[PDB]
């Protein structure tokens, strides 16, 4: 559910390796694995709210997981396991009925046909299961499932034939862009591309077409209007892609030479996203001084009419300083309101991208400005985004103004929340500003953890709240509070399920949380003279299992927000771990320190619950490994464990050249 919620665009190799790693960590039968996967997919589909999220979830659960199963087949007998898991899943009639009635179609038949296409299930078994499902069920608008399954080949065809620009025919380009500009077509194409994992080339191709079309050439009025429409539609699609599927896909991250696209620079320096705040006085916002004067003269004279060749990129860079000049003069009081109305009508008349860039710059400037002076700009901002402008449209205005309204909503709601203002641009953002404004975060964290523990499964809204809480509070606070909440359980099943849920909760960013844990929380709980009173048997065993799971999972080697978070902050790990292979990776240092501490505790005097805890740690460390984190383990603990009381030796020896004789000596003296 966590993978399907956030990072639906990620490579399936990471998901496959994580699933196999989880399967190896705790012994899971294959039919139970597949049944759990299918049940998780369906329950995630059902709870999705109406909108683009339902389309994304349907695309994910009906396109992406067949490749995961195919890769499981390739890496790994599996066929009868899949059939057995399916016959388990077919017993659940109410869940299937709710999923069927939500999507207005028999989704089980489509899923069976899709998995049969991949060859996972045999034809006779497919027919028998279809007959069983129809018997169980016996007790004009096309559904989105068929739309996705029939439009993914359309996505492939469009990606294939667009490279040649349809034999350089602009009219056909307008026709095909208008065809995909109809109801929900863009969202279906984007979801199919994301599920198929081919959106990168799609964005690359649109960026190349935009770079070709911005400069343009000499044309008469009709082809010039064609060029302007191409530029506007490409800009709208790129902006929608940026605001819907993050900032990672459009950016190339691999570009040779100084001929970088201008849209990439605008993306990096001009659009306010959830993780970036712009500087209005950045050097990129001060290109020149004559181009902006030409642009403001054109704006205040009449309709531009010069769009045959206009240098769209330089003009777009110029609206920032232009609108700066108009707003400064307007605040000076030398310009009337009707002049501003005429300027906004000129901006919103023919080309709509200029309004978008002006609104973005206005938001960036307003963010820095003080409370008593911000109200002046918002009225002209909402005038820029007022009702639809008629008697000036070329064609294809409906979805254009819809996508513009959505883009400006997702760009301006952040500042609209700060003040008491509402513009009502007419949901597209159900997960936004969820936590209460005044109460402390510990209360909501504990309440949500208790609710998740009681229910037995994690919801997507809870995932988003956990993500924002982790962003606000920090890794140490989050882990310490969650572990402190863990140690209040007196029942073995409750703490077992708590650890099982907490592993997936910590799977948000495994490296940082395991580093913080193994470097700060376990040594602190193990060294203090008054803390092992809470290290009793059920919570101690559960915490030891969680710790060893996290340690070896991180040794075996997940969000943009956490990516910027751990790229933001540095930490001198050499000073943190003086330490009495590489010795530069912090995981190696912290694990060596932990092993030194565990050896010292085991060999110490006046043993109590902590020695039982370290015995459990060693026991589950031996149990979990296939043969590997025991390379850093000291050689004395081999004899120490025998002293404190076989297979718990040979696996731990690691067959070192010193290991052979130390193991022989240890096992000989039993």
């Amino acid at each position: 559910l966590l993978e399907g919620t956030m990072n639906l665009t990620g490579e399936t190799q990471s998901l496959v390796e994580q699933l196999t790693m989880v399967k190896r960590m705790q012994h899971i039968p294959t039919p139970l694995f597949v049944l759990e996967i299918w049940k998780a997919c369906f329950v995630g589909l059902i709870e999705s709210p109406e909108g683009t999220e339902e389309l994304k979830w349907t695309a994910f659960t009906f396109l992406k997981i067949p490749q995961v199963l195919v890769k499981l087949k390739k890496y790994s007998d599996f066929t009868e396991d899949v059939n057995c898991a399916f016959e388990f899943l077919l017993k659940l009639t109410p869940l299937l009925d709710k999923a069927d009635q939500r999507c207005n179609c028999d989704c089980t038949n489509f899923l069976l046909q899709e998995c049969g296409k991949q060859g996972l299930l045999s034809e006779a078994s497919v027919n028998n299961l279809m007959a069983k499902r129809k018997a169980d069920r016996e007790h004009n608008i096309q559904p989105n499932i068929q739309l996705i399954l029939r439009a993914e080949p359309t996505v492939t065809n469009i990606l294939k034939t667009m490279d040649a620009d349809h034999s350089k025919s602009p009219e056909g380009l307008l026709g095909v862009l208008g065809h995909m500009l109809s109801g929900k077509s863009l969202d279906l194409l984007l979801a199919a591309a994301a599920a198929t994992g081919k959106l990168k080339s799609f964005a690359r191709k649109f960026i190349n077409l935009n770079e070709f079309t911005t400069y343009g050439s000499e044309e008469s009025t009709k082809p010039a209007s064609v060029r302007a429409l191409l530029f506007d539609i490409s800009f709208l699609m790129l902006c929608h892609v940026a605001q819907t599927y993050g900032s990672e896909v459009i950016l190339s991250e691999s570009r040779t030479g100084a001929e970088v696209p201008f849209f990439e620079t605008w993306m990096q320096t001009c659009m306010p996203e959830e993780g970036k705040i712009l500087n209005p006085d950045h050097p990129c916002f001060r290109p020149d001084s004559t181009k902006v004067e030409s642009l403001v003269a054109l704006l205040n004279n009449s309709s531009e009419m010069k769009l045959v060749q206009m240098k769209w990129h330089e003009a777009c860079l110029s609206i920032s300083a232009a609108i700066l000049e108009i707003l400064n003069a307007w605040e000076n009081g030398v310009l009337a309101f009707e002049s501003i109305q005429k300027i906004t009508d000129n901006i919103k008349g023919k080309v709509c991208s200029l309004a978008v860039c002006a609104v973005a710059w206005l938001v960036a400037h307003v963010r820095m400005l003080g409370l008593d002076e911000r109200e002046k700009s918002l009225q002209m901002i909402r005038q820029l985004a007022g009702p639809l402008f008629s008697e000036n449209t070329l064609q294809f205005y409906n979805e254009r103004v819809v996508i513009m309204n959505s883009i400006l909503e997702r760009m301006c709601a952040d500042v609209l929340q700060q003040t008491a203002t509402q513009i009502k641009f007419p949901d597209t953002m159900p997960y936004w500003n969820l936590l209460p404004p005044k109460r402390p975060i510990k209360e909501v964290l504990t309440d949500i953890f208790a609710k998740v523990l009681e229910k037995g499964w994690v919801d997507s809204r809870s995932i988003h709240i956990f993500d924002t809480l982790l962003h606000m509070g920090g890794v140490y606070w989050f882990c310490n509070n969650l572990i402190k909440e863990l140690l209040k359980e007196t029942r073995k099943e409750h703490t077992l399920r708590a650890v099982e849920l907490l592993y997936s909760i910590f799977c948000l960013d495994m490296q940082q949380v395991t580093l913080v844990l193994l470097g700060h929380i376990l040594p602190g709980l193990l060294t203090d003279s008054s803390k092992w009173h809470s290290l009793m048997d059920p919570p101690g065993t559960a915490l030891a299992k969680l710790a060893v799971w996290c340690a070896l999972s991180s040794y075996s080697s997940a969000s943009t927000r956490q990516k910027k978070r751990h790229r933001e902050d540095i930490e001198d790990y050499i000073s943190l771990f003086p330490l009495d292979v590489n010795m530069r990776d912090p995981l190696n240092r912290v694990l060596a320190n932990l092993f030194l501490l565990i050896s010292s505790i085991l060999g110490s005097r006046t043993a109590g619950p902590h020695t039982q805890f370290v015995q459990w740690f060693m026991e589950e460390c031996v149990d979990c490994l296939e043969q590997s984190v025991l390379q850093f383990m000291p050689f004395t603990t081999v004899s120490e464990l025998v002293k404190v009381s076989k297979v718990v030796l040979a696996i731990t020896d690691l067959s070192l050249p010193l290991g052979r004789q130390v193991a022989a000596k240890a096992i000989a003296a039993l």
Binding site: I277, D281, L435, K442, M472, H520, T527, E568, S575
Partner: protein, 476 residues
């Protein structure tokens, strides 16, 4: 002559193992009292959660207060008169420690405030509203009122006349602020509020006061690529609690990132300070990378109506680990700079900086220029200066404490008369106030004791028949 006075260390405190590093705090009171905490991790956690009280006259004996705190202590603050200590850590638990039976070796607390789960990043006492200005030009004016002039700031939260009200204000990790006020009795009134609707990480915070009874709070995320927000706060007690009114002030952006030559360096902000408390028109920023660091100063002077500009920026610095500010209230007027430059009188023009080496630097206040460099022959994590700025205390990354002698001349030779005038002018400041003079005695030479005594004797005389009546015990 920048020198080392004495190094104090404790046996068995060192040789810690499996101890992650933890930040420390230090506090110097009006009397020569030091309150701090040190990283020990020696066979018990509580040794890292104890308050160490030291008296400079007897460094060898130290007092330990076993504070009942559950997390690492963040900040320590003294009162305007050094009779109470404010301590705060993560997970709330703000405590007010009071002196027991008027003994400095016994402390007990009965007043506190608590917010659950939110670590406190900023904490400060309320303002009383009295400050002075010192003029070095009029050091021979032969008049106490002429030398130390009243500045007449206004106090905050005045009730029933001109008597201020006492209390404290704290800022948590999130956009949350708490205010506590103390009744003349044991009653305490507490309230909490949210800064603004924009709730995000506040890694660094600072608090200052302004004339008129307003509080300026500065918040920094710490990413070096986001603006530093400023807010204004007013506290009013409407008959049952202290309500807080907050509004937004213009922000700024970091420098050394638009240079377009090498901007990837210095990716994190590590220190945000106010140049002086009750002086909210200057803000010091210190950013650092894994190797180098940069320190800059900004001001809100009038040329939007209010804008932040750049004053100075050092060439290149190593990793910054500790910064300390002066406490002497210099008048800072134009006519005083020339007479404080021709005469070697630098008691309030220095900012103290420490690095990850054994190097300690004294840098000029208005323009960031180095004037004094000290090498220890390890690095300093927490440090403080004095009211007269004649000495600084420092805590290294070990069990050692250091006290360093700072001289006004800073190596420049001077005649006897100028030194005598400097010493008597500094002593008269402690004469007017109730502060001690141990750091002043650290620098007096044995040869010129008689001249100082006699000249102070005639300084005692020829007063306007009232100063002599209340300064006999102090003059003796």
């Amino acid at each position: 002559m920048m020198d080392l006075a004495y190094v104090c260390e404790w046996e068995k405190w060192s040789k810690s193992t499996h101890c992650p590093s933890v930040p420390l705090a230090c506090a110097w009171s009006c009397r020569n009292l030091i309150a701090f905490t040190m990283d020990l991790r020696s066979d018990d956690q509580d040794l890292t959660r104890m308050i160490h009280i030291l008296d400079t006259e007897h460094p060898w004996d130290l007092h330990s207060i076993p504070s009942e705190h559950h997390e690492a202590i963040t900040c320590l603050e003294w009162d305007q008169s050094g009779s109470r200590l404010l301590s705060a850590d993560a997970d709330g638990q703000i405590k007010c420690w009071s002196m027991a039976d008027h003994l400095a070796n016994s402390w007990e607390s009965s007043v506190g405030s608590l917010v659950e789960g939110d670590p406190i990043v900023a904490l400060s006492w309320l303002h009383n509203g009295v400050k002075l200005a010192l003029h070095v030009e009029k050091s021979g004016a032969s008049s106490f009122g002429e030398k130390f002039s009243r500045v007449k700031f206004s106090p905050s939260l005045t009730l029933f006349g001109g008597k201020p009200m006492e209390g404290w204000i704290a800022v948590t990790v999130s956009g949350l602020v708490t205010v506590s006020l103390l009744k003349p009795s044991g009653q305490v009134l507490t309230s909490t509020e949210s800064l603004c609707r924009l709730r995000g990480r506040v890694a660094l915070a600072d608090i200052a006061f302004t004339g008129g009874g307003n509080i300026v709070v500065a918040t920094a995320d710490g990413s070096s690529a986001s603006p530093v927000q400023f807010y204004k706060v007013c506290v009013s007690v409407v008959s049952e609690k202290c309500r807080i009114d907050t509004e937004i002030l213009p922000s700024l952006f970091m420098r050394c990132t638009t240079d377009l030559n090498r901007k990837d360096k210095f990716p994190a902000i590590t220190h945000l300070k106010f140049l002086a408390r009750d002086m909210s028109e200057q803000v010091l920023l210190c950013a650092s990378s894994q190797t180098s660091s940069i320190v800059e100063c900004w001001s809100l002077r009038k040329e939007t109506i209010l804008k932040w500009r750049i004053l100075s920026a050092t060439n290149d610095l190593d990793r910054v680990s500790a910064v300390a500010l002066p406490k002497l209230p210099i008048s800072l007027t134009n006519t005083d700079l020339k007479v404080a430059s021709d005469t070697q009188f630098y008691p309030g023009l220095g900012l103290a900086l420490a690095f990850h080496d054994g190097s300690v630097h004294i840098v000029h206040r208005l323009s960031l220029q180095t004037m004094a460099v000290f090498y220890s022959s390890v690095h300093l994590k927490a440090m403080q200066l004095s009211w007269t700025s004649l000495a600084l205390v420092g805590i290294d990354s070990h069990g050692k404490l250091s006290v360093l002698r700072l001289s006004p001349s800073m190596g420049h030779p001077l005649e006897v008369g100028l030194a005598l005038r400097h010493l008597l002018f500094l002593l008269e400041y402690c004469m007017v106030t109730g502060y001690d003079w141990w750091d002043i005695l650290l620098h007096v030479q044995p040869s010129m004791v008689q001249s100082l005594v006699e000249k102070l004797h005639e300084e005692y005389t020829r007063q306007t028949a009232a100063l002599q009546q209340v300064l006999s015990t102090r003059i003796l």
